[PDB]
Design a protein around this nucleic acid. Structure first.
Length: 36
DNA sequence: TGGCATAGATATCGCACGTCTATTATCCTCAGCGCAATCAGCTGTGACTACCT
């Protein structure tokens, strides 16, 4: 209801950070499972 | 005594809920072309002077 473009940019930043951190999480799980 | 229903006990297969890397045609950059007011040189014209009569 206030500066919708700022809210959309925040949502995009959250989305890209979430994708980055989730793929990092998957890579870390692959790494430790391979170590085991 | 004996035939077998009726539910206790137990997995069992199906429907549904998480990730993952690619059964195949993009996004900016520099060199190559183009267009419109000066400016200068080729060519035309007048001023000055040579030669035949």
């Amino acid at each position: 209801i206030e500066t919708p473009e700022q809210a959309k940019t925040r949502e995009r930043s959250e989305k890209i950070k979430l994708e980055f951190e989730t793929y990092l999480r998957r890579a870390m799980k692959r790494f430790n499972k391979g170590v085991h």
